[PDB]
Design a protein around this nucleic acid. Structure first.
Lengths: 65, 186, 68, 142, 247
RNA sequence: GACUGCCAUGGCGUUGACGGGAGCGGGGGAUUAGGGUUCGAUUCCGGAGAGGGAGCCUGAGAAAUAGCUACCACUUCUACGGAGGGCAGCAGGCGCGCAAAUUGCCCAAUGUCGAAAAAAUACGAUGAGGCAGCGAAAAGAAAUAGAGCCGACCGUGCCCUAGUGCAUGGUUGUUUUCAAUGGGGGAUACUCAAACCCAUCCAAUAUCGAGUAACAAUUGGAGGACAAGUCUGGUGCCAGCACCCGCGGUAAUUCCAGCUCCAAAAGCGUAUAUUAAUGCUGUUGCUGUUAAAGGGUUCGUAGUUGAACUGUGGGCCACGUA
RNA sequence: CUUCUUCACGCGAAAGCUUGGAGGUUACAGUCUCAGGGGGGAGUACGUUCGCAAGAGUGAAACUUAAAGAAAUUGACGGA
């Protein structure tokens, strides 16, 4: 194979990322509580429907609002 | 040397991210407010298996035994239980069937349907912190399926505070009266 | 076990105490109260048995092997 | 084409077998290759020793440096080159550590850009490389 | 294992059961006593109670009251258990299955046994051997294997052998048609396959199984005064049974 | 011919002998619509075996392995004359290696063997077995709860322009809360060979125990395949990512972190193998003009394959009847 | 022997495909037979057997790799 290189910069990105914080927030419902929960999340609440199946909206995260 | 017949039973369901597959399943799961896809798998299995049996059975050269035997058996319990029907008696629906038919006969759900409880969920939880008699035990296992006369039976654990001539330190949480008597106690 | 609260048994009734004395083993009998079986000691002297088939007479009680 | 029948069963057997032999896959399987050159016997996991930490930067066009290691597999005494996922992790390697190796499905080809590397480090000294890197783990007792 | 399935043993335990003994009524076509002490009459339940039978010997069998639980019981044996004085005979009911079948003391005072072999004895002596453990000296001068023979049991006394053939009330004891009963329709010689046996059951439904497994028991239903298993061996429509069952 | 002694000259093999290859071999096991693949250590049987290696005595019975005998290889002990060992039992140890639990209880049941409960003195014996211990391979079932009030929300119906509103519904929340309520542990009567794994929830008519970071959620993804970011922040062909397609040289969709999301879930990652997908080895059901493949050419025993024909019914009647 | 007009659906990915084509076949099945079964490594190896002698015959794995191929199509181009 062609394959080329030489150790000179390892660790870098993880190390120069600031390790920020995985921010906390509520413990979820689990098991039945969760599945019941999940359902509502995935479907239906406070709502109407035009026609489309889904999208998540973790787009947006470079949002507009 | 020597044995035991234990074994391992049930089968999971093939190949994931199929939007519809996920969707359909879920919706059903949504009706019942569930606790695992495993419960589905379970149903699929069973469903399947009888459905399998169905696949076999009909083709059997007519005038031959099994069809008679098993047909009657399947018919009578399922039908019996409040699953199959009298008109689902030419085994043609048996070929058919629906998963909901089954879910519907999860005894919990039948209950909620029966009225009792405010949902199938409300129904799970009730039964589960020990409530409403039919059998030897309330239904400790709401996991269960129906069987047509349990249908009637469905009522209190008279046993439970919920049908007691007295109550208990729980739910109602008499306890407080114990706390009263010990704490409040003059 | 779990299966709560619950109280279904099975029961038995004896003709005689003799019949009992013969039908019931002593730990059971004890469960009533009426005698004990042989001395246990997790094969303590099971060891004599490990000695005995080859060996004649003598021995003379408490004769003994691995246990030093 | 293929016409033969009825009483020609032999033929059938023979040729198919003959062609099964031919068959590449059938052959691999049948032929027992693993055990041979191939240093893992087939088999699940194996213990070796860190000889040294090595680099790799991608084939073309892919570039940068991800890095593998010279190991000496112990039970069979076999030299191999193995992968480590993430950033850093070199520091878990230590030196001539007696390392716990796993493979890669990959038909014994290799995993990612990197050619030939058919194995990955899974633990050095029992440690769960993985875990540490993640960090469900604390450093070896050495 | 080698559990013998028509001994109706089961599930957990019994690697061996208590193994039977060498001594008439062969391993596979026995139905040895032990199983009876514990598993049939049921009073005695443990091995401990069996053990107890024996350490206080007790149990009793026609002929010899018999000491051996491992000793096969098999077709027609007569048990009396004097504590309560209860008698049973060994015999299949339909659907092939063996019962301990309570029998009249007086009926329980004879039995019938097929001849397996017919011999000389040393001196224009003849002696016959039965398919169940008798050697008997000076029998009928012309008896033969496959003819059964009535025995006193109380006494040592043959009451009969019956000059056999076709068309005679048979209990089929094995092959497929274990517990089937059928008068002999016939046996064709099938030499060295042995005769094969055309059987017709109480329905008058006819059926075949090989001639070897055929216990003549009489003419006109039972010649024998022996117990006749309910139904008397056709084998039929299970289905209906299920149906029947459910009232 | 087991074997001698004599004699004949055989015997086997291309449906393949001989040799050489690979594992004990079955039940079965495993997976394929179907057709099929693959396993079968091990709990089914049957067999096999037993320190290595041979050999024997005895007994009804073994080459008999917690018998001998000698040899090989290894080992103990010795005041070192000599003497002497053999867990592929079981637990234990080490060892090896990727790699696998206890020097636990008990001797009930089961078997099993033995003598065969004066049990008149209760009373064989059992690392088989059975009980636990060990034991996230596996199969069974499951936990974070209910409800209301307010907030608030969206979603309809209409007022109304819509809207407030009202009405018509569904749904959020630090609010709010009374209200749900097992875990979980305990009167325990109540087990168990023993020891043990729950407890009626009575009686101070059991005390006790949930709304929380609690009394707890994982794991792995987010270009695509394959569910799921439009990008917050990092990062900068680096770090590193990437099953395979590929990200990445900076305003990257896949890299770094964050957040959000997703997927499955108390399981999930992984490995290796194996099964299908594969009629992608094909009997069913491939191919072979240019994509693999029909020889330069012919004969030709082997091989296969091989046509017809004398198999058949007939007659009659009845009527009905299309 | 056609050529091949011309016709056949058919068959085919097409290109193309006659006498009785590559037709009448996954609606998969006249016989017999050879061959073939990713690609590369190698048709090679002291592998082996004919053969005077070339070399034929017979014939690999290691190692390697993500394609390789095919026809058409359009485009581009040509010291056409």
């Amino acid at each position: 194979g062609k394959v080329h290189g030489s150790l000179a910069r390892a660790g870098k990105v993880k190390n120069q990322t600031p390790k920020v914080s995985k921010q906390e927030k509520k413990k979820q419902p689990r098991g039945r509580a969760f599945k019941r929960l999940k359902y509502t999340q995935r479907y239906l609440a406070k709502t109407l429907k035009a026609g489309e199946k889904l999208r998540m909206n973790k787009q947006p995260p470079g949002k507009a609002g | 040397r020597n044995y035991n017949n234990f074994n391992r039973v049930w089968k999971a369901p093939r190949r994931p991210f199929e939007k519809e597959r996920l969707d359909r399943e879920m919706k059903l799961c949504g009706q019942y407010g569930l606790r695992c896809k495993r419960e589905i798998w379970r149903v699929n299995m069973t469903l399947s298996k009888m459905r399998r049996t169905a696949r076999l059975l009909l083709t059997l050269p007519e005038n031959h035994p099994r069809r008679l035997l098993e047909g009657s058996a399947i018919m009578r319990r399922c039908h019996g239980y409040g699953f199959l029907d009298e008109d689902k008696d030419k085994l043609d629906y048996v070929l058919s069937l629906t998963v909901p038919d089954i879910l519907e006969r999860r005894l919990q759900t039948v209950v909620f349907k029966h009225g009792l409880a405010k949902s199938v969920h409300h129904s799970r939880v009730l039964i589960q912190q020990r409530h409403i008699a039919v059998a030897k035990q309330i239904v400790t296992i709401p996991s269960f399926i129906v069987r047509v006369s349990s249908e009637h039976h469905i009522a209190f654990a008279d046993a439970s505070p919920f049908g007691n001539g007295r109550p208990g330190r729980v739910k109602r949480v008499k306890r407080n009266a114990a706390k009263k008597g010990s704490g409040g106690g003059d | 076990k779990f299966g709560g609260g619950k109280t279904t048994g099975f029961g038995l009734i004896y003709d005689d105490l003799a019949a009992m004395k013969r039908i019931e083993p002593n730990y059971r009998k004890a469960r009533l109260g009426m005698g004990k079986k042989k001395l246990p000691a997790r094969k303590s002297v099971k060891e004599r048995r490990n000695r005995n088939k080859k060996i004649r007479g003598k021995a003379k009680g408490k004769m003994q092997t691995k246990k030093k | 084409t293929k016409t033969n029948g009825q009483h020609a069963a032999r033929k059938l057997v023979r040729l198919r077998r003959k062609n099964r032999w031919a068959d590449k896959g059938w052959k691999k399987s049948h032929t027992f290759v693993a055990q041979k050159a191939n240093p893992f016997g087939g088999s699940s996991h194996a213990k070796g020793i860190v000889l040294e930490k090595i680099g790799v930067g991608a084939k073309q066009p892919n570039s940068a440096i991800r890095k593998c290691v010279r190991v000496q597999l112990i039970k069979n005494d076999k030299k191999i080159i193995a992968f480590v996922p993430n950033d850093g992790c070199l520091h878990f390697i230590e030196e001539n550590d007696e390392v716990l190796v796993s493979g890669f499905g990959r038909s014994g080809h290799a995993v990612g850009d990197i050619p030939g590397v058919r194995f990955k480090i899974v633990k050095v000294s029992s440690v769960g490389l993985y875990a540490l890197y993640r960090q469900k783990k604390e450093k070896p007792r050495n | 294992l080698y559990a013998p399935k028509d001994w109706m043993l089961s599930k957990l335990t019994g690697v061996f059961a208590p193994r039977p003994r060498a001594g008439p009524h062969k391993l596979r076509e026995c139905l040895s006593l032990l199983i009876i002490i514990r598993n049939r009459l049921k009073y005695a339940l443990n091995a401990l109670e069996a053990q107890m039978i024996l350490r206080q010997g007790l149990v009793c069998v026609d002929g010899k009251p018999r000491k051996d639980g491992k000793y096969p019981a098999g077709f027609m044996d007569v048990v009396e258990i004097p504590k309560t004085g209860d008698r049973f005979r060994i015999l299949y009911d339909v659907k092939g299955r063996f019962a301990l079948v309570r029998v009249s003391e007086a009926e329980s005072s004879i039995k019938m046994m097929k001849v397996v072999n017919v011999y000389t004895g040393t001196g224009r002596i003849p002696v016959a051997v039965t398919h169940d453990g008798h050697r008997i000296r000076y029998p009928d001068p012309r008896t033969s294997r496959g003819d059964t023979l009535v025995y006193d049991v109380k006494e040592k006394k043959v009451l009969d052998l019956i000059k056999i053939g076709n068309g005679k009330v048979v209990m089929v004891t094995g092959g497929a048609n274990r517990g089937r009963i059928g008068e002999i329709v016939s046996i064709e010689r099938h030499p060295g396959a042995f005769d094969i046996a055309r059987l017709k059951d109480a329905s008058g439904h006819e059926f075949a199984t090989r001639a070897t497994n055929i216990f003549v028991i009489g003419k006109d239903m039972s010649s024998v005064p022996v117990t006749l298993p309910k139904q008397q061996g056709l084998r039929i429509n299970v289905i209906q049974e299920r149906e029947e069952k459910l009232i």
